[PDB]
mmCIF file of C-alpha atoms in Angstrom:
data_model
loop_
_atom_site.group_PDB
_atom_site.id
_atom_site.type_symbol
_atom_site.label_atom_id
_atom_site.label_comp_id
_atom_site.label_asym_id
_atom_site.label_seq_id
_atom_site.Cartn_x
_atom_site.Cartn_y
_atom_site.Cartn_z
ATOM 1 C CA UNK A 1 186.897 -30.098 -3.354
ATOM 2 C CA UNK A 2 187.587 -33.809 -3.555
ATOM 3 C CA UNK A 3 187.849 -33.993 0.250
ATOM 4 C CA UNK A 4 184.327 -32.539 0.118
ATOM 5 C CA UNK A 5 182.794 -35.166 -2.160
ATOM 6 C CA UNK A 6 179.125 -35.922 -1.496
ATOM 7 C CA UNK A 7 179.173 -33.139 1.104
ATOM 8 C CA UNK A 8 176.342 -30.587 1.013
ATOM 9 C CA UNK A 9 177.600 -27.080 0.242
ATOM 10 C CA UNK A 10 177.920 -24.535 3.035
ATOM 11 C CA UNK A 11 179.160 -27.404 5.173
ATOM 12 C CA UNK A 12 182.106 -26.496 7.387
ATOM 13 C CA UNK A 13 185.163 -28.671 7.953
ATOM 14 C CA UNK A 14 185.783 -29.520 11.589
ATOM 15 C CA UNK A 15 189.351 -30.719 12.233
ATOM 16 C CA UNK A 16 188.435 -30.521 15.927
ATOM 17 C CA UNK A 17 188.162 -34.139 17.198
ATOM 18 C CA UNK A 18 184.829 -34.788 18.924
ATOM 19 C CA UNK A 19 183.790 -37.991 20.663
ATOM 20 C CA UNK A 20 180.115 -38.944 20.413
ATOM 21 C CA UNK A 21 177.917 -41.853 21.439
ATOM 22 C CA UNK A 22 175.885 -43.581 18.727
ATOM 23 C CA UNK A 23 172.180 -43.516 19.539
ATOM 24 C CA UNK A 24 170.917 -45.003 16.259
ATOM 25 C CA UNK A 25 171.760 -45.758 12.629
ATOM 26 C CA UNK A 26 169.784 -46.877 9.575
ATOM 27 C CA UNK A 27 170.535 -49.661 7.170
ATOM 28 C CA UNK A 28 172.732 -48.519 4.258
ATOM 29 C CA UNK A 29 170.618 -47.554 1.257
ATOM 30 C CA UNK A 30 170.940 -46.260 -2.291
ATOM 31 C CA UNK A 31 170.004 -42.568 -2.380
ATOM 32 C CA UNK A 32 171.342 -41.827 -5.858
ATOM 33 C CA UNK A 33 171.732 -44.343 -8.723
ATOM 34 C CA UNK A 34 175.409 -44.844 -9.481
ATOM 35 C CA UNK A 35 176.430 -43.563 -6.072
ATOM 36 C CA UNK A 36 177.691 -45.303 -2.986
ATOM 37 C CA UNK A 37 175.035 -46.062 -0.408
ATOM 38 C CA UNK A 38 174.527 -43.795 2.591
ATOM 39 C CA UNK A 39 172.995 -44.187 6.005
ATOM 40 C CA UNK A 40 171.474 -41.889 8.581
ATOM 41 C CA UNK A 41 172.502 -41.831 12.216
ATOM 42 C CA UNK A 42 171.718 -40.034 15.441
ATOM 43 C CA UNK A 43 174.553 -39.427 17.871
ATOM 44 C CA UNK A 44 175.017 -37.464 21.090
ATOM 45 C CA UNK A 45 177.551 -35.661 23.250
ATOM 46 C CA UNK A 46 176.869 -34.641 26.861
ATOM 47 C CA UNK A 47 175.769 -31.208 25.647
ATOM 48 C CA UNK A 48 173.451 -32.138 22.791
ATOM 49 C CA UNK A 49 172.542 -34.609 20.032
ATOM 50 C CA UNK A 50 173.474 -34.487 16.366
ATOM 51 C CA UNK A 51 171.940 -35.909 13.223
ATOM 52 C CA UNK A 52 174.538 -37.483 10.998
ATOM 53 C CA UNK A 53 174.771 -38.441 7.300
ATOM 54 C CA UNK A 54 177.484 -40.957 6.501
ATOM 55 C CA UNK A 55 178.686 -41.456 2.934
ATOM 56 C CA UNK A 56 181.420 -43.970 3.611
ATOM 57 C CA UNK A 57 180.074 -47.524 3.786
ATOM 58 C CA UNK A 58 183.334 -48.719 5.360
ATOM 59 C CA UNK A 59 182.020 -47.104 8.537
ATOM 60 C CA UNK A 60 178.777 -49.057 9.045
ATOM 61 C CA UNK A 61 180.308 -51.445 11.606
ATOM 62 C CA UNK A 62 181.563 -48.396 13.540
ATOM 63 C CA UNK A 63 178.052 -46.915 13.746
ATOM 64 C CA UNK A 64 176.535 -49.382 16.182
ATOM 65 C CA UNK A 65 174.132 -48.231 18.892
ATOM 66 C CA UNK A 66 175.546 -47.459 22.371
ATOM 67 C CA UNK A 67 179.062 -47.333 20.932
ATOM 68 C CA UNK A 68 181.418 -44.382 21.374
ATOM 69 C CA UNK A 69 183.366 -43.022 18.403
ATOM 70 C CA UNK A 70 185.831 -40.145 18.075
ATOM 71 C CA UNK A 71 185.424 -38.294 14.784
ATOM 72 C CA UNK A 72 187.567 -35.630 13.113
ATOM 73 C CA UNK A 73 187.618 -33.849 9.762
ATOM 74 C CA UNK A 74 183.847 -34.155 9.627
ATOM 75 C CA UNK A 75 181.544 -31.541 8.156
ATOM 76 C CA UNK A 76 178.749 -29.382 9.535
ATOM 77 C CA UNK A 77 175.888 -28.490 7.184
ATOM 78 C CA UNK A 78 173.627 -26.251 9.313
ATOM 79 C CA UNK A 79 173.745 -28.421 12.441
ATOM 80 C CA UNK A 80 173.871 -31.703 10.472
ATOM 81 C CA UNK A 81 177.126 -33.636 10.671
ATOM 82 C CA UNK A 82 178.256 -34.990 7.347
ATOM 83 C CA UNK A 83 180.940 -37.700 7.265
ATOM 84 C CA UNK A 84 182.877 -38.880 4.235
ATOM 85 C CA UNK A 85 186.223 -40.416 3.330
ATOM 86 C CA UNK A 86 187.997 -37.279 4.498
ATOM 87 C CA UNK A 87 186.915 -37.907 8.075
ATOM 88 C CA UNK A 88 188.848 -39.974 10.609
ATOM 89 C CA UNK A 89 186.492 -42.163 12.652
ATOM 90 C CA UNK A 90 187.990 -44.318 15.388
ATOM 91 C CA UNK A 91 186.777 -46.250 18.435
ATOM 92 C CA UNK A 92 186.781 -43.848 21.378
ATOM 93 C CA UNK A 93 189.270 -43.889 24.239
ATOM 94 C CA UNK A 94 187.710 -44.618 27.667
ATOM 95 C CA UNK A 95 188.822 -41.298 29.124
ATOM 96 C CA UNK A 96 186.969 -39.598 26.267
ATOM 97 C CA UNK A 97 183.779 -41.496 27.009
ATOM 98 C CA UNK A 98 180.923 -39.977 28.968
ATOM 99 C CA UNK A 99 177.389 -40.513 30.221
ATOM 100 C CA UNK A 100 174.715 -39.144 27.891
ATOM 101 C CA UNK A 101 171.969 -37.196 29.743
ATOM 102 C CA UNK A 102 168.508 -38.851 29.498
ATOM 103 C CA UNK A 103 166.809 -35.656 28.307
ATOM 104 C CA UNK A 104 169.286 -35.453 25.421
ATOM 105 C CA UNK A 105 168.697 -39.048 24.283
ATOM 106 C CA UNK A 106 164.946 -38.612 24.414
ATOM 107 C CA UNK A 107 165.186 -35.189 22.760
ATOM 108 C CA UNK A 108 167.027 -37.059 20.045
ATOM 109 C CA UNK A 109 164.351 -39.712 19.520
ATOM 110 C CA UNK A 110 161.536 -37.213 20.144
ATOM 111 C CA UNK A 111 159.294 -36.209 17.253
ATOM 112 C CA UNK A 112 158.305 -32.557 16.961
ATOM 113 C CA UNK A 113 154.677 -31.559 16.626
ATOM 114 C CA UNK A 114 153.721 -30.564 13.081
ATOM 115 C CA UNK A 115 152.436 -27.183 14.292
ATOM 116 C CA UNK A 116 155.827 -26.444 15.829
ATOM 117 C CA UNK A 117 157.632 -27.849 12.828
ATOM 118 C CA UNK A 118 155.847 -25.293 10.633
ATOM 119 C CA UNK A 119 157.483 -22.512 12.671
ATOM 120 C CA UNK A 120 161.024 -23.683 11.964
ATOM 121 C CA UNK A 121 163.043 -21.946 9.267
ATOM 122 C CA UNK A 122 162.476 -22.907 5.652
ATOM 123 C CA UNK A 123 165.164 -25.322 4.493
ATOM 124 C CA UNK A 124 165.273 -27.058 7.879
ATOM 125 C CA UNK A 125 165.769 -30.810 7.635
ATOM 126 C CA UNK A 126 162.854 -32.602 9.287
ATOM 127 C CA UNK A 127 163.137 -35.919 11.130
ATOM 128 C CA UNK A 128 160.298 -37.676 12.904
ATOM 129 C CA UNK A 129 157.611 -40.366 13.127
ATOM 130 C CA UNK A 130 154.152 -39.380 11.892
ATOM 131 C CA UNK A 131 150.801 -41.077 11.311
ATOM 132 C CA UNK A 132 149.516 -41.185 7.742
ATOM 133 C CA UNK A 133 146.028 -39.717 7.147
ATOM 134 C CA UNK A 134 145.905 -39.578 3.368
ATOM 135 C CA UNK A 135 147.819 -40.568 0.216
ATOM 136 C CA UNK A 136 147.899 -39.359 -3.384
ATOM 137 C CA UNK A 137 149.869 -41.248 -5.995
ATOM 138 C CA UNK A 138 150.646 -40.245 -9.589
ATOM 139 C CA UNK A 139 153.609 -40.598 -11.946
ATOM 140 C CA UNK A 140 155.560 -37.459 -10.925
ATOM 141 C CA UNK A 141 155.240 -37.983 -7.125
ATOM 142 C CA UNK A 142 153.518 -39.433 -4.066
ATOM 143 C CA UNK A 143 151.900 -36.995 -1.653
ATOM 144 C CA UNK A 144 151.326 -38.116 1.891
ATOM 145 C CA UNK A 145 149.294 -36.172 4.373
ATOM 146 C CA UNK A 146 150.723 -36.799 7.820
ATOM 147 C CA UNK A 147 148.822 -35.822 10.933
ATOM 148 C CA UNK A 148 149.258 -35.004 14.638
ATOM 149 C CA UNK A 149 146.462 -34.812 17.168
ATOM 150 C CA UNK A 150 146.415 -31.058 16.402
ATOM 151 C CA UNK A 151 147.751 -30.507 12.901
ATOM 152 C CA UNK A 152 148.500 -32.037 9.518
ATOM 153 C CA UNK A 153 151.115 -31.300 6.865
ATOM 154 C CA UNK A 154 151.828 -32.569 3.363
ATOM 155 C CA UNK A 155 154.940 -34.623 2.688
ATOM 156 C CA UNK A 156 155.536 -34.967 -1.041
ATOM 157 C CA UNK A 157 158.089 -37.473 -2.376
ATOM 158 C CA UNK A 158 159.273 -37.426 -5.998
ATOM 159 C CA UNK A 159 162.497 -39.451 -6.329
ATOM 160 C CA UNK A 160 162.615 -43.291 -6.337
ATOM 161 C CA UNK A 161 159.840 -44.465 -8.742
ATOM 162 C CA UNK A 162 157.750 -45.515 -5.719
ATOM 163 C CA UNK A 163 159.527 -48.449 -4.025
ATOM 164 C CA UNK A 164 157.679 -47.475 -0.866
ATOM 165 C CA UNK A 165 154.602 -49.435 0.142
ATOM 166 C CA UNK A 166 152.855 -47.499 2.928
ATOM 167 C CA UNK A 167 149.186 -46.503 3.094
ATOM 168 C CA UNK A 168 146.634 -44.785 5.311
ATOM 169 C CA UNK A 169 146.693 -45.325 9.072
ATOM 170 C CA UNK A 170 150.294 -46.555 8.936
ATOM 171 C CA UNK A 171 153.238 -44.848 10.685
ATOM 172 C CA UNK A 172 156.090 -43.331 8.745
ATOM 173 C CA UNK A 173 159.547 -42.512 10.011
ATOM 174 C CA UNK A 174 161.087 -39.647 8.065
ATOM 175 C CA UNK A 175 164.720 -38.711 7.456
ATOM 176 C CA UNK A 176 166.217 -35.503 6.019
ATOM 177 C CA UNK A 177 162.993 -34.103 4.503
ATOM 178 C CA UNK A 178 163.100 -30.419 3.615
ATOM 179 C CA UNK A 179 160.669 -28.029 5.208
ATOM 180 C CA UNK A 180 159.555 -25.680 2.454
ATOM 181 C CA UNK A 181 157.933 -22.462 3.549
ATOM 182 C CA UNK A 182 156.773 -20.043 0.885
ATOM 183 C CA UNK A 183 153.664 -18.405 -0.612
ATOM 184 C CA UNK A 184 151.147 -21.003 0.577
ATOM 185 C CA UNK A 185 150.783 -23.845 3.014
ATOM 186 C CA UNK A 186 154.221 -25.117 4.125
ATOM 187 C CA UNK A 187 155.195 -28.611 3.074
ATOM 188 C CA UNK A 188 157.759 -31.294 3.810
ATOM 189 C CA UNK A 189 159.705 -32.311 0.740
ATOM 190 C CA UNK A 190 162.050 -35.131 -0.239
ATOM 191 C CA UNK A 191 165.631 -34.123 -0.762
ATOM 192 C CA UNK A 192 168.779 -35.893 -2.006
ATOM 193 C CA UNK A 193 169.242 -37.943 1.142
ATOM 194 C CA UNK A 194 165.579 -38.112 2.197
ATOM 195 C CA UNK A 195 164.569 -41.497 3.513
ATOM 196 C CA UNK A 196 161.298 -43.162 4.579
ATOM 197 C CA UNK A 197 161.101 -46.190 6.871
ATOM 198 C CA UNK A 198 157.762 -47.480 8.142
#
């Protein structure tokens, strides 16, 4: 349970070595005061793409775009790969490299429509780029209203005493926001590793 530090629960250990190609990665950022920084990344095999959360800062150099890395002892939290100090992350061997299908790359950088987001299971982590229609700011949280051409949903953010400086008509890129579906209009909500980046 110390190999599983900073790892979301339910996450499954994968000793099975898998080589991926790095599509993108964010700048390292503080997600919890007193904790090591983390960054978000998007990777891809031939078959499909994965969203990745990395909690070992000693790996930032490794996570460069268009690079191929072989990972092992990584975790799987409901389709999301979580990498910590337990994992082995090395530069890939050439024979393990591959060509990533175009449709997979684009499906990785594609942003779902809000109306189709709303149909995903509650608890699903939501990534995407959305236009901002409306903003409400108070002391507990900031509530954005993001819009499509067809639909709008509310993205409420409670955690980092409002470091963010985005307003109406701007474009927000979201990371690891929780889709909450209950008795009422579904919302997107900030979680532990949730990250905004306009």
